Design an enzyme around this catalytic site. Structure first.
Site, mmCIF file in Angstrom:
data_model
loop_
_atom_site.group_PDB
_atom_site.id
_atom_site.type_symbol
_atom_site.label_atom_id
_atom_site.label_comp_id
_atom_site.label_asym_id
_atom_site.label_seq_id
_atom_site.Cartn_x
_atom_site.Cartn_y
_atom_site.Cartn_z
ATOM 1 N N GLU A 3 -16.863 -6.722 25.129
ATOM 2 C CA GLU A 3 -15.879 -7.805 25.186
ATOM 3 C C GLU A 3 -14.705 -7.554 24.247
ATOM 4 O O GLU A 3 -13.543 -7.715 24.636
ATOM 5 C CB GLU A 3 -16.529 -9.155 24.867
ATOM 6 N N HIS B 131 -25.906 -19.022 25.255
ATOM 7 C CA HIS B 131 -24.844 -18.810 26.234
ATOM 8 C C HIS B 131 -23.920 -20.006 26.398
ATOM 9 O O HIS B 131 -22.882 -19.878 27.063
ATOM 10 C CB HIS B 131 -25.446 -18.483 27.612
ATOM 11 N N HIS C 114 -5.222 3.431 -2.740
ATOM 12 C CA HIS C 114 -5.124 2.669 -1.497
ATOM 13 C C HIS C 114 -3.972 1.672 -1.540
ATOM 14 O O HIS C 114 -3.249 1.497 -0.547
ATOM 15 C CB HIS C 114 -6.440 1.931 -1.224
ATOM 16 N N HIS D 62 0.840 -1.192 0.000
ATOM 17 C CA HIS D 62 0.000 0.000 0.000
ATOM 18 C C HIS D 62 0.876 1.242 0.000
ATOM 19 O O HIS D 62 1.704 1.423 0.897
ATOM 20 C CB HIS D 62 -0.932 -0.036 1.207
#
Ligand SMILES: Cc1ncc(C[n+]2csc(CCOP(=O)(O)OP(=O)(O)O)c2C)c(N)n1
Ligand SMILES: Cc1ncc(C[n+]2csc(CCOP(=O)(O)OP(=O)(O)O)c2C)c(N)n1
Ligand SMILES: [Mg+2]
Ligand SMILES: [Mg+2]
Lengths: 670, 671
Positions: free
Chosen positions: B410, B472, B261, B26
């Site tokens: 999380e 869960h 990019h 890049h």
């Protein structure tokens, strides 16, 4: 004010709170806190038909704060959408219709599976895309076939999860005014006050995301304001609406406003006291009064009257536009287009080599021409993933009846939105990113499998074969993860025929999400590959010859199967071996097959037969079918593909040496 | 003067040459962000080129890791351990210059980036550390820790949920030592950002309680870049976002197009760009004498600042020797004297306990002797048993504490935990239910790749959790973790093995640990031993010397005690010779010599019944076992005992499966 509404709300609070108490497990505070919203949504706002929870023009509802399930079940009981009182009394019990978090596969009237925070609200963004798209595609001036809204409730937890941060950004970008999200702003999470960890100016943040924001300061008692803000939100069709509803968790009870109200902190005596506070009989348990029953009987009747007006309008539309009506019916019945398999390309070894990602793009564009219900896109990797659809346009603000979605750099939001599109009905959605970044999104992908959402995940750049982008991009553990997830297919096609077989497999297994793992660089079209046999997970490309030479099986998939053909040439002509070649495009599809078939292919009932496998990933699981193998039990490298393959032994010469070494040792032991 | 522009342009062009040489990578963002980089390394950042681990350095993170060529150019120019030949080995096998930066490979690379959103989220953890250490150790006269965290990110990082989570926490905690420069270039891979990303970023970050500053001409207004950074530093109560408008590929033929990019400038294009920037188009991989001289002076000025700090630290160490010794010990990663005395010991006479509660006891014990312990739970402190008695929360204006309230975040939590470790001086831990670590696996996998020594407490590890149900209950997670290189997953069966799991974490200091813990009480078992957990599997009860038919029963976590109850039936009702093996960690076991593995599992014997029970996918079980009880389906919202009865997690079902395997083997062998 009419006292019946307050009476309904209070009986909903106490019936909901009784379900976890009966189970000795679950959450009472939010069901109590959100009862006013629920009463308003089901009695005045939402259009549904209690006798057909799959009515194609229903308003879909989603409980993003899934721990509040007792509230949802109470509402489905009161609106007679398939739950009995005995079902409510079976809350959180084995085999019941009322699990502790809602599951769409178990319960009628439950649209998606929630419990993992942030998922439901993100699902709702996908349903709002569907609602806008179908209104644009099918409505006429006189026939508003699709004119529905997506309602969701969430709590503070969903407002903190990145999956919904991603989906909310897209919802504002796309101007999805058919989405109405009610936020239970109760200043409580499990650890305590939200001040411990969460102090954002939500109103200012959502305005920055191009949402409209409305507020209800007294969400415990001001149910007319809840109704008013919802109705005003629906009038702004150019922005999704967030309604910040201030409630007290466990309102009216001993534990009101404390973090213990989140869970199960109200016993029999506490509920008696709450019932007295609310003007109800403390001696009657699991009780709905005759007046509340009569109120909801009237609600149900008014819903049906509205449904009958739509149905008569749809019958008129269907006479005037039979072919369009036929298409709508086919899509919402999940039926596939007539002769759809003719769109799957076929190849032979005489065709030029191609990368399987490019071959996948050819299939996608072929089926796009005949699947009006195909919808999806890439997480900012449309060219590299080969997901672009020629001559289609992006879904954008004020242009919703298109097929391509620019998800941006939002893998987790992508998959949750894709889930929502499928769960709405009438769509066969797909999504795309590099295989290694599906673990950004596994929260939602796992839910596709649990929910039976039929979504297609295009996953290119599936191994170290991708080369110089290096170990942060090269999966090692992902194929093993997917093979260990129930109700999920992972298919890794070796060539053009097998890419067609992978799409054939997806549409032949309509209750299971599919991940198709695709390679970066060209691979040859191979001998005897067969699209229909991909459905069996593994199958024989070249069987044993009739010689008396020692037998060997070589198995592989994806970009390395061609190495097995090269190794076979050496083993046969330089070492006088009788080599079978097995293609192993899908462990999950293979495991579905009868054991007699599995042994007929892998012959893993023969301990001394060399049974070889090669795959650029963790060797976890390989001992099931194989006794000699080349895998990768380390992270990769930033280097050209050929250098990585040379260093790690992904060469025909190394396959040969591994097999010969296994065999020489076996013979000496024998 | 003209020297700053000349430096910037040589940085643009040298950076753009590395991908061209590799024919991979890049060029656009390295060109576009060169002014930021020149300002950061020449004027803003305090570092010492001869010690990239200086404890008071300003840490830098490249969150848009695809711009790696820019970072490598700066590490070369500031003589932090890369040569010109290293730059020319960009993206080549074994080089110090991989296509995305890897902290384990390259000096001066603080974290591993490439997966978007991670680096900026790591920077939040690094800022927590910088605030914490200043509060804990600085005196009025000795500013031992007075450093700032600098990061660059692009549009992709600003869209990723992991950084949406971490940025919310950064503003909540008021981490003014964090300075994030956002390359606002209106470009991502698919094209213009208006395809998918039109947020009002300034208003959003103000709502998150960040300060927001802007540079409207980030291609040429390098004095304004410097000015806004210095002003951002003065606001210590809010993290600062600096929105720097640049053109991707500025000055080149691909400027402002999404082709910029990646790799879109060839040899001729770079000659034309060099002419545009006033450089000699005939010199390749070239830094002029004037620019080399400028960066030599930069390096000397940074060293002068370091010597001033070193003299102050020497004076501090004479006045406060015990404190100085603690700082040194923490940043050396050395453990406290006699730390293993903090690990409790149990016997089968002790009362049953859940392994999550037993973990909480160990955590609080080591907390007393580990000043470097830091962490918390993602809104599950009580259920995860992560709370530290008599410790306080880190909060705005109170940073020298040990507990972090991560909230419901999380992924951001694990990325912040990575950042806390990567800063140095810390032994961080985090916590959630095991099933929700897949929300955070982007960051967890990078802990493994980066050798971040983080502790992941993962409770409610199976269907044993009961009524919360299948959303869960993990099925696939143990298998995922076992398939991830450089990661330990440990599932201790009882109190002794919980101590062994903490022992294992601190005995393997370059590997993240996940400890899987159960919800309900289990018995303390015969002959469990903390030191043996380090071997991953070990024998609890071995064969007697009889000639009775042999059986091995293996288990872990909350099901190992079922193997003891099955053994009693097999021995007393069927006269079998039964070994019991504890298998707390597949990953620790796999690193043992094969001879050890076979001595425990005996999986070189095809006819020996080799049983395993685990409430998870059977993927991988055939390596060591030939009869087993697993779960190859999702779970149920039901009481634990109902699930175990339905799925056959009972001593009687273990017995029936073993006996059926044996009867069948006898029959086959008689043939
Ligand atoms: C992804 C995920 N992380 C954690 C949990 C555990 N959990 C359940 S509810 C909750 C937070 C409760 O806060 P909020 O959403 O505000 O609900 P309230 O307690 O106000 O009802 C958490 C962390 C979860 N269900 N999903
Ligand atoms: C999690 C993740 N998803 C996708 C990618 C692939 N990728 C690399 S850069 C990029 C987008 C580039 O956008 P931006 O960050 O604005 O960078 P620019 O092109 O402006 O330098 C993407 C999608 C990635 N590296 N990580
Ligand atoms: Mg709340
Ligand atoms: Mg950009």
């Amino acid at each position: 004010d009419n006292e019946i509404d307050t009476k309904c709300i209070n009986e909903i609070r106490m019936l909901s709170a009784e379900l976890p108490l009966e189970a000795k497990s679950g959450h009472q505070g939010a069901p109590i806190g959100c009862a006013p919203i629920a009463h308003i949504l089901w009695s005045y706002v939402m259009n549904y038909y209690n006798e057909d929870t799959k009515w194609i023009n229903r308003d879909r509802f989603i409980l993003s704060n899934g721990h509040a399930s007792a509230l949802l079940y109470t509402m489905l009981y009161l609106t007679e959408q398939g739950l009995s009182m005995e079902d409510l009394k079976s809350f959180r019990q084995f085999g019941s219709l009322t699990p502790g978090h809602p599951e769409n596969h178990i319960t009628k009237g439950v649209e998606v599976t929630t419990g993992p925070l942030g998922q439901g609200a993100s699902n709702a963004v996908g349903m709002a895309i569907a609602a806008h798209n179908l209104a644009d595609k099918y409505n006429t001036e006189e026939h508003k076939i699709f004119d529905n809204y997506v309602y969701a409730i969430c709590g503070d937890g969903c407002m903190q999860e990145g999956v919904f941060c991603e989906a909310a950004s897209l919802a504002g970008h796309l101007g999805l005014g058919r989405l109405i999200l009610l936020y239970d702003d109760n200043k409580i999470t499990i650890d305590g006050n939200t001040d411990l960890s969460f102090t954002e100016n939500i109103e200012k943040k959502f305005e920055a995301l191009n949402w409209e924001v409305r507020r209800v300061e007294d969400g415990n008692k001001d149910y007319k304001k809840i109704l008013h803000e919802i109705e005003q939100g629906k009038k702004n069709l150019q922005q999704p609406t967030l309604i910040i509803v201030r409630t007290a968790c466990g309102f009216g009870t001993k534990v009101e406003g404390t973090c213990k109200s989140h869970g199960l902190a109200l016993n029999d005596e506490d509920l008696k006291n709450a019932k007295s506070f609310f003007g109800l009989d403390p001696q009657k348990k699991f009780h709905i009064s005759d007046e509340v029953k009569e109120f909801y009987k009237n609600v149900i009747q008014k819903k049906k009257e509205n449904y009958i007006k739509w149905k008569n309008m749809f019958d008129d539309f269907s006479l005037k536009y039979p072919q369009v009506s036929q298409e709508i019916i086919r899509r919402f019945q999940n039926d596939l287009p007539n002769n759809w398999k003719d769109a799957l390309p076929k190849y032979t070894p005489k065709d030029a080599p191609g990368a399987t990602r490019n071959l996948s793009g050819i299939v996608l564009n072929s089926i796009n021409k005949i699947f009006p219900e195909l919808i999806g896109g890439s997480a900012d990797l449309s060219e590299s993933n080969c997901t672009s659809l020629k001559e289609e346009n992006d879904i954008k603000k004020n242009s919703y009846g298109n097929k391509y979605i620019r998800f941006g750099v939002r893998e987790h939001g992508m998959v949750a939105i894709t889930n929502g599109l499928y769960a709405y009905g009438g769509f066969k959605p797909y999504c795309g990113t590099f295989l290694n970044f599906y673990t950004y999104a596994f929260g939602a992908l796992r839910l596709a499998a649990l929910s039976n959402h039929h979504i297609l995940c295009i996953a290119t750049h599936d191994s170290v074969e991708l080369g110089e982008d290096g170990p942060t991009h090269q999966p090692i553990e992902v194929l093993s993860l997917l093979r260990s997830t129930p109700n999920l297919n992972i298919i890794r096609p070796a060539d053009g025929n097998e890419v067609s077989g992978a799409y054939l497999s997806h549409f032949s297994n309509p209750h299971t999400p599919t991940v198709i793992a695709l390679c970066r660089n060209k691979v040859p079209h191979l001998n005897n590959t067969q699209p229909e046999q991909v459905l069996k997970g593994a199958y024989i490309l070249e069987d044993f010859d009739t010689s008396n030479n020692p037998k060997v099986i070589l198995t592989g998939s994806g970009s390395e199967l061609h190495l097995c053909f090269e190794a076979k040439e050496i083993l046969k002509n330089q070492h006088q071996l009788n080599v079978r070649i097995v293609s192993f495009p899908s462990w999950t599809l293979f495991k579905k097959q009868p054991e007699d078939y599995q042994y007929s292919v892998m012959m893993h009932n023969h301990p001394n037969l060399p049974r070889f496998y090669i795959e650029p990933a963790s060797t976890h699981g390989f001992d099931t079918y194989f006794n000699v193998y080349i895998g990768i039990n380390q992270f990769g490298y930033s280097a050209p593909k050929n250098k990585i393959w040379e260093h790690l032994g992904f060469t025909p010469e190394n396959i040969v040496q591994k097999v010969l070494a296994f065999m020489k040792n076996k013979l000496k032991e024998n």
